[PDB]
DNA sequence: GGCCCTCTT
DNA sequence: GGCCCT
């Protein structure tokens, strides 16, 4: 349990929204030691400048071929499609991907905590569903997770708690590369660099094992 | 298809208590106002800006009880509710006890089933508190088989801003509520807010009603 | 799809 | 009724 040593910012892109029984099309992890986060110094400004990511970070970004077509809306905003992913030789969500995730997580200082925007309702349940289809034991065993919407709400102290709304509320600039996995992870990181010590305290208190996350859907 | 069928009775509920959740509060007052769904189906459409406060239905069952808590009220609680443990006892009020459970069961039992409790911030206060108080008793729960919904969630859906009871009431009707922080007063205020868009409320309630047995107690007890 | 709706005394 | 995720 806490204190959490590493925060792993997570974002998934997929074929659609949960009622559609979606499948992952892109995945990004950005791992940062809690020290790098608290070391961030939001410079003077009105609006405050967007902080640079810490120098020392681990990053993984992967495109994934789904077993079903993206919804038109999902394709439009992500810039991905099943057809393009296939011709670019992307592989399905498979055992080897699970091995990659575990190895990546395992070289992070422990314990780790996944951080995703609306994670409790989307990213974590969806990820649980994808992993459940595999033969590998869950690569996220021992890993914790929190939802940054819950975090940001509690840290205050609004019309919207969407990723973009929060970012703009803080920095009054548009996020870049929205609805791309890496783009959204970097945006989330910038938000979480605003008041890192308060965030880390909240994370330490509210982090729960990823293994407690119920799958989005069950594929009986 | 509706998850639990039509809710035939809406039971507007409010509690007064010794304090707020972190204090392990105990109930000091309880009011139930039971209304057949038809009384809501029969409520007039709210027209005008502002509309008048809806007329309460003629046919209603009401229960309002003052209850001696097991601990003193916080000074803040006493100030706003006008109740204190000592004075409730001077007035000979009984504790939240087996008798009360039997009373509540009988009251609910002559309502058409199923019943759905409606309380403002009920999901985070009234329902968990009531669950805790009933859990203390050896008597079986009189609320098994009943459903519940939070009217904050309801009014947010219906309004499509503060969502305190008084704020909503004032926003809809341009009037100050009366007898705030009394159980019966707040129940009548709640009734009025829920009568604003009565057909839409009923549909939302039917869609979001959840079994009371799924409500987690506010706090644990020896 | 599931839960949240920051108020409650 | 819509968040909020795609
Ligand atoms: Co679409
Ligand atoms: Co009937
Ligand atoms: Co209506
Ligand atoms: Mg996302
Ligand atoms: Mg994204
Ligand atoms: Mg109340
Ligand atoms: Mg009250």
Author numbering:
A (entry chain B): 8 to 164, 174 to 236
B (entry chain A): 5 to 164, 175 to 236
Excerpt from the publication:
The structures of TREX1-L-structural dsDNA and TREX1-Y-structural dsDNA were solved at 1.7 Å and 2.0 Å resolution, respectively. The nuclease activity of TREX1 was enhanced in the crystallization conditions of the TREX1-L-structural dsDNA structure. In this case, the input DNA substrate was digested by TREX1 into 2 small ssDNA fragments, including 6-nt- and 9-nt-long ssDNA (6-nt-long ssDNA: 5′-GGCCCT-3′ and 9-nt-long ssDNA: 5′-GGCCCTCTT-3′). The 2 ssDNA strands then hybridized to form a duplex DNA with 1-nt- and 4-nt-long 3′-overhang in the crystal. In the TREX1-L-structural dsDNA structure, 1 asymmetric unit contained 2 TREX1 monomers and 2 ssDNAs of 6 and 9 nt in length. The annealed DNA strands formed 2 duplexes of 1-nt- and 4-nt-long 3′-overhang, respectively. Each 3′-terminus of the DNAs displayed an L-like conformation, and for both duplexes, the 3′-overhang was inserted into the narrow active site of a TREX1 monomer. The Leu24-Pro25-Ser26 cluster of molecule A capped the 5′-end of 1-nt-L-DNA via contact with the last base of the nonscissile strand. Leu24 and Ile84 in the narrow pocket of the active site in molecule A also stacked with the last nucleotide at the 3′-end of the scissile strand as in the TREX1-dI-T-dsDNA structure, indicating joint actions of the two structure motifs for removal of the 3′-overhang. In molecule B, however, it was a groove composed of Ala161, Leu162, Ala214, Gln217, and Trp218 on the other side of the Leu24-Pro25-Ser26 cluster that contacted with the 5′-end of 4-nt-L-DNA.
